[model samples]
Target: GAPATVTEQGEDITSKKDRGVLKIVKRVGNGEETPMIGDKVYVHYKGKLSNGKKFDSSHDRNEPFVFSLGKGQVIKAWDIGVATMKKGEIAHLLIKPEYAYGSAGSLPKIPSNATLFFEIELLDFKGE
Candidate 1:
């Protein structure tokens, strides 16, 4: 459905600087300079809300995620986040409502003006 995340007691989760309307939490890799445009990739991911509620995940489903970078097929934060990863790497993508679902948010669970958390594992990547 939506996604999965890791949260604390109440609200006030950790996040990074704002990229337009989206916010980044943490990005971890082997200094490969992140992914670039026109790259194919595979990953195991988990998505949730700021309240630690799970929504979507490839890992939990026992599958790997495969997509293209900068393809305009997914959310802006995901497009940007995937562009910053490589093969066999993992990243935590914390996104704000504006970057995620905007003011409308998703169906149920994901409230308006909510922040989303994503654990992205880069299974493979190929730069174009």
Candidate 2:
């Protein structure tokens, strides 16, 4: 079945599925390039546990997170979602447990079965 229509305020720009729900809040880039496997992708991201408690944010440190694409260095939802983003795109990812922490929580900040929401902004990338 099709997913329900997205709401406003926490308004949705539009939504798409590559598994975990992706709400593209702000569109950026020219669409000429996207990250490929082995590319060094740079991003600024904020992670929340749906309860509005922030677990992490690269923006706070003023350092963008850099990771190799599709390398299992990040969560499954991010690997899937970021791979599809054009540079400079800011998106909200409502990641299910399986794609995030799964049944086991990550210590004190997060709990089991928590559906995480990540706000990620693609900065740039370079090939290896």
Candidate 3:
């Protein structure tokens, strides 16, 4: 399917794939290592829907996120994607709704069965 415009909270979201949506934009990249399993990493992230409704953000909280790559600590997509990330590298992730909240999105902010977009920035890593 061709890309189309989707409206989420209040902004227009552009689909990168036929059914995948782009929700985040990376502002920085340190360009370190392609992260591996059990590798701890710090990142500044912001999450939103097609409508521009923000659901999560480390920068908004004035902090960075630290997590193990491929540890199942976060969403399943992160497990697969983070492992390929390098320190100081920034990338935009277009998550299908299925890879994200599935058919039941988080209440209030997220709608039922919504895709996600992550502007990921790899900062540092502490491997386990």
Candidate 4:
């Protein structure tokens, strides 16, 4: 199912910026507050297509993937879902094609219109 995205300023932006469509199952929880935007986050995750294909993973490298939260450095699922997580939170993120790669998926691995599910564990995060 294809959903409409707002195209403004030569970018595909969500109509509702502060909301997301990810199904988050928190396997582990923490007492600390969630990290805000612009925070440097370290997370390890495995990626799979809806068909159960392992397309990518950060855990395979034996190092957590570090990135800026709420930034456009990654997919919409990570940008939205990861910001809602706290330290040591293990979450299963079920994302659809609309909120993910859409019809034009990542080449050489991910297929078009494929739904992606990510199993993520937040190692830690810090802000500047």
Top of the candidates by TM-score = 2
| TM-scores for every predicted model | 0.69, 0.79, 0.70, 0.78
What CA root-mean-square deviation does each model show from the true structure?
A: 5.8, 5.1, 6.5, 7.6
As a TM-score, model 2 comes out at 0.79
lDDT value for model 4: 0.71
Q: Candidates ranked by lDDT, best first? A: 2, 4, 1, 3
Tens digits of per-residue lDDT for model 4, 16-125: 65333454545666866988889998988887787775557896797889999888788877887887777888776666677888899877577898777677888889
Residue 103 of model 1, lDDT score:
88
Model 3, span 20-62: residue lDDT tens: 4333323444555577688877877766675556667888778
Q: In order, what lDDT does every prediction score?
A: 0.64, 0.72, 0.62, 0.71
Higher-lDDT candidate of 3 and 4: 4
- Could you arrange the candidates by TM-score from highest to lowest? 2, 4, 3, 1
Steric clashes per prediction = 10, 0, 11, 0
Instruction: Provide the lDDT at 103 for model 2.
Output: 89
After best superposition, candidate 1 residue 50: deviation in angstroms?
1.0
